[PDB]
Every structure is written in C-alpha cells, then in structure tokens.
Symmetry: C2
Subunit: 110 residues, 2 copies
C-alpha cells in the first residue's frame, strides 16, 4: 500500500508573496498551541523565519491574521482565512476527482 495521489493548493500573491502549506500550517499550529515559537519549532525553523511568515500574513490582507495576547492567536479574520483555505482545498478535491482517478489508473504500481 502507498498513500493516495493528493492535490495540494498554493495561491500566488504577486509580486512577492505566497499562501500555501507553510503559512497555513503555521496558522493551524498557532490556533493549536497559542505560540509562534512552538509553531516554528514544530516546523523546524528559527523563530526569525517563523515570525517573518507571521509578519507576511499581517501585511498581505486588510486586517491582521495573527495577534499577541497574554502569547499568540488568530484574529477573527485569521480564523476566517484558515476556514476559507480549508474550503478551497475541499472544493479543489471535488473538482479534480475524475482527473485524480485518471492519474491513479496511470500511476506506476511498482
């Protein structure tokens, strides 16, 4: 047995930016641990590199995505962004289902 074929989504924010697995995982991990340093640790990166992803997220949109507290959290908007990316993933999977079947039939068994 191996795992199924799986589409993965990223969205380009031209010119400089992206929203994909790395920023979504950070967001999910902030929702779960309440900590930027913990999320960075989980993802095997320095606090600097993690914090720069946070900083990117807080300048990509009209509202902040992550905020401090008494020490981090998703804002109302951040939670909305995360749910909408999850929905996009679901919608993409639905749309590509037949294409995946064709890839799967054509995939080398080994």
């Amino acid at each position: 047995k191996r795992l199924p074929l799986k589409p993965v989504l990223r969205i380009d924010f031209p010119p400089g930016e992206r929203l994909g697995h790395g920023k979504v995982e950070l967001m999910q991990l902030i929702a779960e641990t309440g900590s930027i340093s913990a999320a960075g640790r989980a993802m095997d990166m320095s606090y600097r590199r993690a914090w720069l992803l946070v900083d990117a997220l807080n300048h990509m949109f009209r509202q902040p995505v992550i905020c401090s507290q008494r020490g981090a959290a998703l804002t109302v908007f951040g939670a909305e962004l995360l749910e909408r990316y999850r929905g996009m993933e679901e919608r993409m999977n639905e749309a590509l289902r037949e294409d995946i079947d064709w890839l799967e039939a054509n995939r080398n068994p080994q």
Copy 2:
C-alpha cells in the same frame, strides 16, 4: 494590481510530486526538442534536468518523454500535460468565488 492565482501540485506518495518543475520541463521539451535546452531554460544542470525526466518516466505505466540528440513527449506525455492544463482550469473555476474573497481582503498596499 496583478491577480491572485491558485497553483496546483499533485503528490505522488511517497517522495514524488508532479507540479510546476516537471510540468515546465515537459512544456520546454515540447518547445525546444531537447532535455539539455530545457535544463538551461530552467537554469539547472543537465544532470538535474535528466533526473526530472527519469522521475517522470518512472511515475507512470509508460514513458512520458522519449529520445527523438533530441527529446519529445510521448503520446501519453502530451496527454498528461494537457490533462494538467485541464486540472488547472477546473481548479480555477471551482475556486473562483474564493479567489474573489481573497482579492477583496487583499492589502491595497
């Protein structure tokens, strides 16, 4: 001003992926007729380009690229590439309302 754009990659567990690098490589083989010209276009060594070709020719039940120097897509390969373009369109259409919501919340800057 530039538009948000969803991008597709497909995981081939374990360890493999079909995304922008391999698709760009297929598209370049089609346009140039050679692996080496395609590697140069992507700014990678021939060796790296040849390993992408080799990975593609082992992901599926038949080869994607064949020697034509020279190289071309096989009929299956040309269909794979057309299929990925179809998947991109299908994804763009399914995500259209979502991309709009992203555009509306985007930083004016």
